[PDB]
Amino acid sequence: ADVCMDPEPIVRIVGRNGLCVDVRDGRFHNGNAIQLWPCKSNTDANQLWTLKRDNTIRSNGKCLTTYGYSPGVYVMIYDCNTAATDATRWQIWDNGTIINPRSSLVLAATSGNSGTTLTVQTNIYAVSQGWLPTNNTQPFVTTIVGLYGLCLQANSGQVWIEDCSSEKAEQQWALYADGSIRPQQNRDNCLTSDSNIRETVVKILSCGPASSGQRWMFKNDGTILNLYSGLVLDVRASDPSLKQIILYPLHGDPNQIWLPLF
Amino acid sequence: QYPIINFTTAGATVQSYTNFIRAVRGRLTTGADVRHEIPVLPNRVGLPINQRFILVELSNHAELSVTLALDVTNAYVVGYRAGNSAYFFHPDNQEDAEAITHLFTDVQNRYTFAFGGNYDRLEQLAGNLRENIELGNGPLEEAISALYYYSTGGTQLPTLARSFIICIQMISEAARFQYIEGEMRTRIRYNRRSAPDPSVITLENSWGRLSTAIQESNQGAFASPIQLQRRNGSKFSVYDVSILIPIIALMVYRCAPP
Numbered sequence: 001a002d003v004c005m006d007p008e009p010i011v012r013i014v015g016r017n018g019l020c021v022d023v024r025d026g027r028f029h030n031g032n033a034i035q036l037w038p039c040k041s042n043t044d045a046n047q048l049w050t051l052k053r054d055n056t057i058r059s060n061g062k063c064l065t066t067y068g069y070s071p072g073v074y075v076m077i078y079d080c081n082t083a084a085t086d087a088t089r090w091q092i093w094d095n096g097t098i099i100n101p102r103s104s105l106v107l108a109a110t111s112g113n114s115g116t117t118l119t120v121q122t123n124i125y126a127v128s129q130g131w132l133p134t135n136n137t138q139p140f141v142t143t144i145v146g147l148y149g150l151c152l153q154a155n156s157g158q159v160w161i162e163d164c165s166s167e168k169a170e171q172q173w174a175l176y177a178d179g180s181i182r183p184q185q186n187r188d189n190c191l192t193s194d195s196n197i198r199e200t201v202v203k204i205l206s207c208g209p210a211s212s213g214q215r216w217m218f219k220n221d222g223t224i225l226n227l228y229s230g231l232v233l234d235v236r237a238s239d240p241s242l243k244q245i246i247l248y249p250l251h252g253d254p255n256q257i258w259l260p261l262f
Numbered sequence: 263q264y265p266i267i268n269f270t271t272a273g274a275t276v277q278s279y280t281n282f283i284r285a286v287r288g289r290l291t292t293g294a295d296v297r298h299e300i301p302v303l304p305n306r307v308g309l310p311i312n313q314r315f316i317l318v319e320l321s322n323h324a325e326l327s328v329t330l331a332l333d334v335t336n337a338y339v340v341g342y343r344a345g346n347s348a349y350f351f352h353p354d355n356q357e358d359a360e361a362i363t364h365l366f367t368d369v370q371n372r373y374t375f376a377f378g379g380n381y382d383r384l385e386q387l388a389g390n391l392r393e394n395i396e397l398g399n400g401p402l403e404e405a406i407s408a409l410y411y412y413s414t415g416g417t418q419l420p421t422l423a424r425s426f427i428i429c430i431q432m433i434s435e436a437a438r439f440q441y442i443e444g445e446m447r448t449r450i451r452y453n454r455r456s457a458p459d460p461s462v463i464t465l466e467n468s469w470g471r472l473s474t475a476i477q478e479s480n481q482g483a484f485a486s487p488i489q490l491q492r493r494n495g496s497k498f499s500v501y502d503v504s505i506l507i508p509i510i511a512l513m514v515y516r517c518a519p520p
């Protein structure tokens with residue numbers, strides 16, 4: 001029936017460390033900065049954004065505008081008509097990236113600290129550049145089941161696959177808006193991958209750097225893709241015994257397929 | 263001739279099941295229309311009756327065989343053949359009634375049930391809710407035999423309806439969600455027979471709503487939240503498409519892309 005009619009939803013924008021895209025101190029004068037800030041449970045328009053049809057993101061009437069088309073400038077709130085036209089335009093991608101078409105610079109937060117000013121960096125699919133439009137302020141907690149029906153499990157600084165004990169040493173994971181996969185019991189730890197090399201062993205380090213090796217995405221084909229490198233989670237030589245999850249190019253066998261069980 | 267995928271519960275294994283569903287999905291979509299990484303099903307309007315159905319043939323240990331006919335536009339099980347007879351759920355509109363005419367043209371006896379295939383009607387007749395009907399390979403063997411003998415008259419109506427609820431969930435609902443496929447796959451791996459969780463029942467019910475929300479979302483953002491359930495029953499709301507990408511495998515066409 002007809003052609004699809006995309007609506008204009010009012011939603012929060014959760015990003016790095018589960019923080020929200022906030023308009024500093026609730027003020028809307030042209031230029032006031034945009035910052036990361038603990039998400040609020042209310043209607044303060046300084047934290048709710050309307051995703052317009054024209055591709056502009058508006059809070060309380062003003063446009064989310066970038067200062068310039070240079071890696072490093074900050075993102076400010078501004079009058080939509082006054083602001084340079086294509087400096088208010090953004091596309092929200094399915095892989096949590098919010099890009100400014102015109103400069104190719106992605107909305108980022110180069111610090112996980114509350115109050116950090118948003119900026120536009122060069123795209124490297126890092127956790128510091130992943131965002132998600134949702135009124136859901138909490139990360140999604142699930143069980144990740146993979147090869148042979150075994151569960152993904154973490155033990156301190158390591159991660160391997162093992163049989164699913166519906167209670168065991170935290171096999172529950174929390175998926176953040178920033179695209180990081182965090183161990184339920186220790187939420188400032190990220191499923192990390194040191195290098196983007198054809199066999200590096202995935203481990204659990206701190207989300208501190210929010211690097212591009214800590215951001216993943218669940219594909220429709222059941223794999224877990226590392227956006228930056230293009231490599232997917234792989235259980236080493238279909239051998240759960242080896243206790244090693246590596247980054248490996250895609251081939252689609254059962255050792256690269258995962259399903260989020262919630 | 264319509265495409266024919268076959269699966270047998272004889273030496274059924276987790277692999278043969280994953281290939282079966284992979285084959286069923288492979289035949290429903292043409293891969294031409296994909297949105298937010300999720301394949302959409304053909305548009306009903308303008309679809310030549312020669313690419314309107316696919317045929318799934320099931321056979322169990324007892325050597326009994328049955329052939330289900332699924333509608334390619336919604337992965338809906340519209341009828342089936344058993345031996346020399348064919349039975350069709352009561353069509354809910356003229357167009358559909360005219361289409362099932364081209365199915366099982368061979369058969370000497372074509373019967374059209376007085377009821378539809380929808381779950382309510384089927385749960386009512388079965389005398390059970392989807393929540394009490396167990397699923398697994400055991401239940402599928404029993405359902406095939408039950409379905410088969412209905413042609414010879416040795417299957418009561420309550421049991422036919424309980425068998426339709428089993429097949430629909432293990433084939434049509436499994437092809438629609440990787441989540442439900444994995445659910446069925448777990449029941450086979452450990453030889454379990456158990457009714458679907460609140461999570462499965464809810465995903466089945468929200469298929470239409472989700473198909474719509476995603477297709478007419480503004481860049482993956484939904485206009486209104488779709489509410490789903492967890493395995494334990496607790497609810498949660500979905501506002502974005504991204505969290506569903508690894509859960510939905512097929513979408514019923516709702517509207518054209520801009």
Ligand SMILES: *[C@@H]1O[C@H](CO)[C@@H](O[C@@H]2O[C@H](CO)[C@@H](O)[C@H](O)[C@H]2NC(C)=O)[C@H](O)[C@H]1NC(C)=O
Binds near residue numbers: 009043484485487501
């Ligand atoms: C997220 O929450 C906000 C507010 O709680 C929702 O915004 C309201 O949306 C309704 C209808 O869409 C409007 O009539 C109200 O004016 C909005 N509230 C405000 C800010 O005044 C928003 O819809 C929620 N996100 C979604 C898509 O569910």
Ligand SMILES: *[C@@H]1O[C@H](CO)[C@@H](O[C@@H]2O[C@H](CO)[C@@H](O)[C@H](O)[C@H]2NC(C)=O)[C@H](O)[C@H]1NC(C)=O
Binds near residue numbers: 094
């Ligand atoms: C993130 O998602 C976007 C989807 O918009 C990807 O970028 C586009 O990819 C398609 C092909 O899938 C191309 O036709 C476009 O030219 C790309 N850019 C744009 C602006 O549409 C992007 O590649 C994805 N990231 C990764 C590495 O998976």
Ligand SMILES: OC[C@H]1O[C@@H](O[C@H]2[C@H](O)[C@@H](O)[C@H](O)O[C@@H]2CO)[C@H](O)[C@@H](O)[C@H]1O
Binds near residue numbers: 024025026037044047
């Ligand atoms: O920037 C931090 C935080 O500010 C809140 O606004 C405060 C503001 O900090 C204060 O100077 C003013 O007097 O009261 C305001 C209301 O509490 C914002 O509400 C919040 O979203 C953050 O933006």
Ligand SMILES: OC[C@H]1O[C@@H](O[C@H]2[C@H](O)[C@@H](O)[C@H](O)O[C@@H]2CO)[C@H](O)[C@@H](O)[C@H]1O
Binds near residue numbers: 235248
């Ligand atoms: O090198 C990791 C790589 O292993 C493959 O499995 C190999 C494995 O190297 C060894 O047991 C032998 O050579 O044959 C196996 C079967 O290919 C995996 O296929 C691949 O996904 C990676 O995990």
